[PDB]
């Protein structure tokens, strides 16, 4: 099945998922000098006060922190978006070392990791329907650099030992994703895709300019996870990022100058 290795990684995905070579694939490199400042872009509205996290899952590729999305409790609106998008899950992508891990790049700079908060457009009723539409998802992407610890990340870090291997999950209630945000909501935006199979071209990407800082110890705990299942040969969960894809006929817009 697909993964991140030599034998099943991003350069292979197009065989089972031909949309891998499509017209609006993600991630991309953000060329800061080419991105157009767009004064029509509104401030992002991130409303996570009523977010209900439920569970954390090691899915064999990353770990997902899952939310109750049965009502409008944690939503993303404004920015480049029309309508209301409900938070379903967040996850990360990270590297074997601090010099790689992010999926988007900024003037070819790779960050140590990238957080994706995934939200679906409520006008399509459920996530499975939303991913079939070109405006079905909004993914908020946040870079991670290594330096000072992120206090609001530590609860995530300290549950990882309980979900070491693929298919393990744990209760993860009352987690506040506001603690993962940077100070500024300045962003870049462009139309793209899911960055892992099925690679569906359903995402409005919103990538924050300001990275969050996490500690080396925090990221090291991400790197102790396993791609494999319980008792199987240990394969550390590292380098679970897709590289930058061709921009093709797309414009990256900035909310700031
Ligand atoms: Zn992702």
Curated annotation (Swiss-Prot):
Changing residue 59 to L: Reduced activity. Changing residue 91 to Y: In OPTB3; partial loss of activity. Zn(2+) binds at residues 91, 93, 116. It catalyses: hydrogencarbonate + H(+) = CO2 + H2O; urea = cyanamide + H2O. One of its GO terms (molecular function) is cyanamide hydratase activity. Transmembrane segments: none annotated. Its EC number is 4.2.1.1, 4.2.1.69. Changing residue 114 to Q: Strongly reduced activity and sulfonamide affinity. Changing residue 91 to C/D/E/N/Q: Strongly reduced CO(2) hydrase and p-nitrophenyl acetate esterase activities, impaired stability of zinc binding. Changing residue 64 to H: Enhanced proton transfer. The keyword rRNA processing does not apply. InterPro entries: CA_dom, CA_dom_sf, Carbonic_anhydrase_a-class, Carbonic_anhydrase_a-class_CS. Pfam families: Carb_anhydrase. The active site is at residue 61. Optimum pH is 6-8. Changing residue 141 to R: In OPTB3; complete loss of activity. Changing residue 15 to E: In Jogjakarta. This is Carbonic anhydrase 2. Catalyzes the reversible hydration of carbon dioxide. Can also hydrate cyanamide to urea. Stimulates the chloride-bicarbonate exchange activity of SLC26A6. Essential for bone resorption and osteoclast differentiation. Involved in the regulation of fluid secretion into the anterior chamber of the eye. Contributes to intracellular pH regulation in the duodenal upper villous epithelium during proton-coupled peptide absorption. One of its GO terms (biological process) is morphogenesis of an epithelium. It comes from the Eukaryota. It comes from Homo sapiens. CDD domains: alpha_CA_I_II_III_XIII. Its cofactor is Zn(2+); Co(2+). The lineage of its organism: Eukaryota, Metazoa, Chordata, Craniata, Vertebrata. Target of drugs used in treatments against glaucoma disorder and breast cancer.
